[PDB]
Structure formats: C-alpha cells, structure tokens
Amino acid sequence: AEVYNKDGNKLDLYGKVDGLHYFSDDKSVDGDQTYMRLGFKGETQVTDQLTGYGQWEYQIQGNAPESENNSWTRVAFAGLKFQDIGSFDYGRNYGVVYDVTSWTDVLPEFGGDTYGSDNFMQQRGNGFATYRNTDFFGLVDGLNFAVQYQGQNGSVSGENDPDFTGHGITNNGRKALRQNGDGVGGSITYDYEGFGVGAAVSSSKRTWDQNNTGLIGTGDRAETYTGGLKYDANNIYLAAQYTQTYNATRVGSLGWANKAQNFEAVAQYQFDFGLRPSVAYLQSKGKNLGVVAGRNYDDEDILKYVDVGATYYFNKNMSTYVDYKINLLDDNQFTRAAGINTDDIVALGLVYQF
Amino acid sequence: AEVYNKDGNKLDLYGKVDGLHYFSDDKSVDGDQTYMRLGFKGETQVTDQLTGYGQWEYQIQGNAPESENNSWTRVAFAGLKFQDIGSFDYGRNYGVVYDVTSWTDVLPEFGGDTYGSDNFMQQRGNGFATYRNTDFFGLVDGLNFAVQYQGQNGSVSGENDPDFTGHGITNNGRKALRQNGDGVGGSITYDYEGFGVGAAVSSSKRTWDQNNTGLIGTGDRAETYTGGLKYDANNIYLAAQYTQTYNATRVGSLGWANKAQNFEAVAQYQFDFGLRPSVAYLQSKGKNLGVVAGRNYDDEDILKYVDVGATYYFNKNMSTYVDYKINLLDDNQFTRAAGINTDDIVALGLVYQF
Amino acid sequence: AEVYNKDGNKLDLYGKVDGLHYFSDDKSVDGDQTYMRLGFKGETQVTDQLTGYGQWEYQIQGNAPESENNSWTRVAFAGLKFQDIGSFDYGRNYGVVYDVTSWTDVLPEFGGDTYGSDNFMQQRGNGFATYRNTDFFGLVDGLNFAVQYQGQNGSVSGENDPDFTGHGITNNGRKALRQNGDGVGGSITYDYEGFGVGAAVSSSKRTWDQNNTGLIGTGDRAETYTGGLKYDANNIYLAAQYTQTYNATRVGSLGWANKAQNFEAVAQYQFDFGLRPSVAYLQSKGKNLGVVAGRNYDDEDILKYVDVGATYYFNKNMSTYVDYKINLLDDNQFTRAAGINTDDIVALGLVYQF
Ligand SMILES: CCCCCCCCCC
Ligand SMILES: CCCCCCCCCC
Ligand SMILES: CCCCCCCCCC
Ligand SMILES: CCCCCCCCCC
Ligand SMILES: CCCCCCCCCC
Ligand SMILES: CCCCCCCCCC
Ligand SMILES: CCCCCC
Ligand SMILES: CCCCCC
Ligand SMILES: CCCCCC
C-alpha cells in the first residue's frame, strides 16, 4: 500500500501473511508452513527524466516457536532510471536468467524449483549490478533486454569457522553451494499482442570451495542457456521455459549436475468470478552426472512432477488456494543421497496481502 | 496507527518501545530488559457481510549488543469473517484457553505466567485453526464461543541435528518442551452489565519426544480445564481464573507437572487523572509430581507470588509503570533443579506506543 | 517519511537501502557490502509543554545468502521532554561521548572508528539513562549539556554457555569485549555563529570477565576524556575531536589499550549542484600497551588512515558516493595479532532513503 506520496517521493509499504499448511508423507515438509513477507518499494522523482529508487523485501517464517527466528532478505537494492536510456541498480536482486524462467514461476504454491536462491545468476543472489532497457530506448515497443554482472560471493574469512578453507575469501562468505565467482549474464524478451518470446544466458566463474570440497559437478564455470515462450491474454495464461545448464543446477546438497536439461510448462485460466485453475509440468534431467555418493550414474531425474491446483481471489487483498504436487520421481538411492522430496504434497493456503 | 485506508482495505501499523529495567537478586533476570514490538492489522472489505483479514506481530529485544539479534514472531495469521456466521483464521495465534486466562493477564509487567508460549493450546503457538462466533450468531448479545484445532508441531527432520530422534518429525521441528501433537479446544464466554463468566477446555496429543527424552510429566495427552470470572465497569477491573492441567504445565526445563492447579486473581482501579494501581496473586501448585532431578516429590509450588504495581498513563501513546513481584517461593532443591525464579523483582518501565 | 500525524501523535517511518561494494586486498572486507536500515521516530504531544517520544532503528545486512540472517538493533528507547526543563530517555541509545565525537563521524562510508559499538559509553550501547538539556533551560542559546548513566551489561547466566564464568552475570549477558559495569558520563557543547566547541567525559566500571579472561588493558575503570571543535556554515564543514582513553579503546579482539590517544579531523564543502567532497585524517595511538600476543609493546598505532571521498546528492532521497581509505598502518605482528585492517579500501555506494 502507498503510505506516503509527497515532495517528489513515494513509498509503497507492502506485504502478506500466508496461513499455509502442507500435507505430505515426506515429514521434512509436512505440517505448518505459515509465513509472512514485508517490503517497501520507494521511488523519488529527481528530474522529469531521472528517477531514483530502492526496494527491500523480507521473509519471516510463521511456523517456528518463539525460542527461534527464521527470517531472511529476499531482495535489497537501490538504483537509477533515466527515460529511454535504461535503469541501473545494485544490491541483492534477481539474476537476469529469471527474466525468462519467471514466466513459469506462477503456481499457487510450488513450481519455480528447477533452480534455487543463491544459485549463481539463476534467481535471487548477492551483488548484482543490473542494466535494464525497456522498449529498446523507446524505439521498439515490447522489446526489452538486460545486461548483468555478479561479483564474487566467496568463502568465510574467519580462520576458526568450520567451513574455513582460505581460498576465495570475501567479506560475506558462505557455504560452497551458495557461493559464486565473477559472473556475467544477459536476457532479451519480445512481447507482441499477448504472445511473448525470451532468451537468456549466464556464465559464472566457480570458486575454489565449489571445486575442492568433495562436491559433484566441478569445473571452471557455471553456465545457463534459457529459451522461453508465453501467451498472456483473454484471461488465458500459457508459458513454457527450457534451460540447459552446466555445473549450475544443484543436486540436493551433493553439489551440481555436470549437465542438466530443465523444462517447465504451465496453463492457467482466470474466471471473472474469482477462480483460477492451474496445471503444470516440471522436470530437471541430469546428464552424465558421474559418481554420486558411492555410485556411478549417467542420466537421472533431479526433479519431475505434475502440479494441479487453483487459487480463488476474494479480491486484490485476499485469496485462498489449493496446490497439489503429484511427484513422479521414484524413491531410489540417488534421491535419498541427495535428499530430494519424492512424495506427493498438498498445500492449503489463506493469504491476506496489502 | 492507521497508515492506509482506501479501496476497501485498511492497514494499522502498530508497535511500542518499552524502556524497561529489572532490579533483582536473581541475576538471570536483573538488568536492562528494554524491548520493542512491531506489527500490523490489515482488514479488507470483500462484500457487505464478508471481511478478509491478516495480522502479524514481532518482538525485537532492545537489551542485546549489536553482535547478536534476539527477535521472534508472536502471531502471524490470516482469516475470513462473515457477519453473524463467525470467523475462521489460521497461522500462529493464541490458543482458545487464553480467551479466559487472558482476563488475569493484565499486570504492568509480570503476571500471565502459570503457562507459557508454545505450551500446547494455552497461549501462543504454531498451526492454530480457530473458529470464532460473537454474540451467538447475533442472537444472544454477550455470548461468545470458539472451537480450535492445532496441528502437530513435532521433532526436527535433520539427521545431524543434536535434538534429532526420528519420531514425530514435522517440517517445523523444535525441542520437546515446545512440541505438540494434534489438539482440539474450545471456549465459551458470557458478558452482561460489566460481569463476565468463562470456561475453556483443551486436549492435545503429546509427541514421542515429549514422552521419551527423560522429561517429567509423561502421558498420552496434555489437558487443561479453565474457569474464569471478571467485573469490568465503573473504572474497576476485577478478575480471577482457575485452571487444572494434566501433563501441560511446564516445570522449568525439566518437563511437565503430572497434574497442576493454577490460580490467578487481580484487582485494578483506573483514576481519571491517569494512575492505575494493580494488586494480584498468582500460584501454580503441582500435584503428585513424582521423581524430579533425583528426588521424589508429591505436592510442590511451581509458581507463587503477590504482584503490586501501578501504571500512569500520560495519554494513549505514552505511559510509565512500576511493578513489584513479591516472590513467595522458597529457594529449595526443587526450584533450583527447575531453574525457577524465587527472588523478588522490581520493574521500571517507560513506554511509547503508536 | 511521516506516515501518520493525528490526535496529538505522529510517526516518522524512515530507512535506507545502500547498494554498497568494497574493493580491497583485505579479503575480510572486500566484496558486496549492501545493507539497509529501517526505523521509526514517534512523538506524542501530552500537554503544550510535555512531549512523549520513542525511537527504534534496525540494520539488516543485504550481502548475505537467504540461508542466514545478519541483523541488529542500533537504537531502541523511549522518553519524555518538558519545555525548558530537559529530556529523559532510557533504552539502547548513544553514549554522551558521541555528542562530541559525532562531529567527525560524517564521512561517506568510513570514519567514526577510533571507537566502536557496545564500547562502554563511547557510542551505541544497552541500558542508557540520559538526561539532556538544550539552550541551558532556554536561557543561553547554543549551550547544551547532557548527564548519562549506563547500567551494568555483564556475563551470561547460562551455566552450559561456553562464555560462562559465574561473575558479573546480568540477564542480557554477552562477551567481555562488549560488556560494561555501571558507568556515568557527561557532555557540554556550545554553538555560536557556525563555530562549535565541545567537551565530554565518561567513567565506567569494568566487569570481572573484562579483567580475568586473558584480555589486555585490565583495570578497575574505563575512562574517556574528549574535546571537540567545529565550524558548520557557508556550505563549509570543518571538525576535529581529540579523545584520551584508559582501558576503553579496543585493540581488535585482544582487549583494550591501557591508554590511547585518538584524533579525528575532517574538512568538507557542499556545492549547490550536489557534489560534496570530503578529506579526513584518523589516528589511534596506543600508549604503554604492554604484553600483546606473546610480545612486549610500548607505543603502537591501533588506527591510522587518510580518507578521501565524495558524495553526490541527486536530491534528499537519492545519492551516490565514493570513499577511499588510504591506510597508513604497516602490516606487522601487532596488527596481525589484533586482526586490524591495514590495506586500502575503496567503497562505491548508491543510496535510496525515505
Ligand atoms: C465469453 C465469456 C465466457 C467465457 C467462458 C470461458 C470458459 C473457459 C474454460 C476454461
Ligand atoms: C492437520 C490440520 C490441517 C490444518 C488446515 C489449515 C488450513 C489453512 C488454510 C485454509
Ligand atoms: C465519583 C468520582 C470519584 C470516585 C473516587 C474513586 C475512588 C477509588 C479508590 C480506589
Ligand atoms: C541501575 C540503573 C537503573 C536504570 C533505571 C532506568 C529506568 C527506566 C524506566 C523509567
Ligand atoms: C559565491 C558562490 C560561488 C562559491 C564557490 C565556492 C568554491 C568552493 C571550493 C571548495
Ligand atoms: C554504484 C554502487 C554499486 C557498484 C557495484 C560495482 C560492482 C563491482 C564488481 C566487482
Ligand atoms: C491423495 C489426495 C490428494 C487430494 C488433493 C486435492
Ligand atoms: C525492596 C524494595 C522494593 C520496592 C519496590 C517498589
Ligand atoms: C588504487 C586506486 C584507488 C582509486 C580510488 C578512487
């Protein structure tokens, strides 16, 4: 909600509370999943052409006891936008690969999980410098593109930390699975009369910890190549994305896939009375994975499920949903070693937002 | 404060800063206790009869150094209210037992501590599904009731976690003392010309960890039976609550009382010039407690104190208070083993709220 | 921004997002430093003369992965202000020594680091009771003073905590380096036609942990004596502060300087077109430090650098800066033992604020 708008500056203070419950045989996801989000979008008018802006978003789990706190920053960035020249922002933000893969990240509860957070330039991560251009300098309507750089987020600097290695240290160190070296990426999208087409590419240097702490999927670089299609008109939403990755797709907590072929497709319709049915298919197929937890593998499913669900919108501030993950992965030594969910999940949600 | 009210949606952004200091011989409570609360109540008008709502409340300690952060969610829920039919909400919320026991939880600083948080269905906890009905479908003024369900909040799912057992795992695992199985509860209250009468009952299944990790007060279920009385009129506030519990009242960090008889009573008056004196008595008497930390017990006091204090209200946004816990527990092997405060505490508070 | 102003109460909900990056050979500070601040200043009008107020400020790091959360309260206090009599507030706040030393804490990114947080009464800390008087009861314009008390913030109360000692326990325990005993301080400042002069003194009792856990700089008390000068007019800002400390200046994580002589000086000019160049010098000279990490020392530099930089203000809501720490400390056994940064740092910042 816009809580302030005066002297060439406005502030949108937004958030949501999602009363959420998972039903599953997988007890590590079963039960109360209640959470909330809080954030602000701020925008100041410097000149007629120049805009300054800042955005921050925070998730706070609502399913924990008061003896603990599970919360985190999703995004936190500041930037400048000049009319028909482009925008530049820096901070924690979305990687440009998500410009295209977001087209399928529209399910009521699940979806969007052939990649993760702090996963190179595929979704949210630290230290993104992002240039964006809308309508090609105002010359070609519907033609957007983006060029992005991500600085290294490396190893821990404290010598007594258990994860300490001494290689690729940065101030904001973390575990190898959420590290990254210097990276560059770009996206291009074209919209025309409801139809949309998109491509995105990213190439990140991999850190020392990522290639020398016994994790699978080692190599000099992590790469992604994404193509996307969508139709968004007449209350119909169809979308599909195909991404091919190299040393970039996480295989649970074991490391990365040497190569992965990811596919997501979704079909949705929006009734005027408030109901919005959703059907989707997601798969991540690892290729030539090699040795994983004591056994040799070639091709293995990392993710594979059909998603059936529905959201009912009471209005723009209140909604409820059901989402049903029909999991098609088999329970095997690969999935157990990686700790990948292979059971079905039903989600029931009640959401207030402002 | 109401910071937004437009297009059938309003947002109350509220909070307080309590500059608070404890004086006590008990050094584990002595010293700076400064804290703050922040929250929002959001409400959207869907139709003339149907309201959607969401609420979130967060406590952040103000007595810690910047090298740490001690904060937590108190409540986080979303819901729907239909005129003369009832309300339904889900999330982290207050258990229905608190509908009656809250009548005595009105002291300046202390009180409200014959039960705790994440303590089955007695106060705040995760995964409450709560149906509420006010004025019996609009037919009997002053007659409210509630029916509540709490889903299991069980053991940790991570095999390498030190608290891991493998039994009763849920996604949002925690220590046995703050766990709970499936639970059901209800409350009924009747108000008439200042006088009030209330009853509440809860029955929760106890988890495996709760009955097999060496904690006292084991059994199939945790049960509470509460009766309450109050008078709230002519600037006078009197209230009393009696609760009898089975395997539900925590005896410090040792487990639970096999049986407990809890009693709280409070008398307050509100002068027009701003002063509000307060006198109260609280006791929790454990019955047939059995073996506790190497010794056999029958009846023992878990809690016993008189509370004398006063709040002065400068206005609705600013107040100050003194609260004096006159502790009647003796320092003995039981209280030391449980880690229960047995010394007197004086609290001085200065509170800004919005 | 003022998001509420009604019924004799107003609320300023403020904050900033700083997209920030450090370039340094020191890898423990190199990389993404993005962060945000959030806070509120609330003020209620009780009578024509009496004002009630509360303030809270929170920092949340924007450079971490979502698997962790690095945040903290900077200030959290409530208070009362009576016209021409003074103000009183209690909570987490700034020590009165900072009334004078803040005059040099005005650099784009660095500076203000001859002292730290939770460092006795020198900057932010827990449990400050602060009396402030502006314009000497309204009798002498430009003459301010302050009298402050800080309650003990001592050792941890949990017997199984690794930092447990059993001495000087308070409820809000923490590590010796951020502990303090009972302390008293005062400041006096006089402003006249742009020029300013200030003096401040603090004396804190040192805790048992501080003098018996193998830390350097032991003694009965921690003392500071500060003198300050400034000129703030005609778009020119000049300021200098000199502080002499005893058992109060932290030498990295090793303890404190027996004695320290701190000096900060800054010169800034503000162009109307938005640019604000900055040049500064900071030094902390330890005196008679004694034995430190196996070697005997007399005089050693704890801090020594020149700071060159600039801030460009697009407007009051958006700015960008560069800051260049030219580090004059040599890399030696003292600095390595203390873990003090001895390399140069360049900072680039883009800041949105509201
Ligand atoms: C022309 C308005 C009615 C359109 C009906 C849409 C049916 C969609 C079924 C998925
Ligand atoms: C096992 C208890 C299930 C609780 C259902 C909560 C539903 C909330 C969203 C409507
Ligand atoms: C009729 C107004 C005066 C009432 C005085 C109340 C005295 C209360 C003492 C506790
Ligand atoms: C030992 C120092 C006591 C500090 C008192 C603070 C009072 C704050 C509430 C008025
Ligand atoms: C009178 C307006 C112009 C003043 C110029 C200031 C120059 C400052 C150089 C640091
Ligand atoms: C303008 C502030 C943000 C600049 C970010 C620079 C990133 C450096 C990559 C090594
Ligand atoms: C196995 C039952 C699934 C039902 C979800 C709607
Ligand atoms: C022992 C002194 C108690 C005073 C509290 C008002
Ligand atoms: C060593 C290069 C420093 C430049 C900072 C402006």
Residue numbers in the entry:
A (entry chain A), B (entry chain A), C (entry chain A): 1 to 354
What does the primary publication say about this deposited structure?
Porins, which are beta-barrel proteins that traverse the bacterial outer membrane, facilitate the uptake of small polar nutrients and are the main entry pathway for many antibiotics. The crystal structures of OmpF and OmpC show that they are both built of 16 amphipathic β-strands arranged into a barrel with a central pore. L3 folds into the channel and narrows the pore at about the half way point, forming a “constriction zone” or “eyelet” that governs the effective pore size. At the eyelet, there is a strong transverse electric field due to the presence of conserved basic amino acid residues on the barrel wall facing acidic residues on L3.
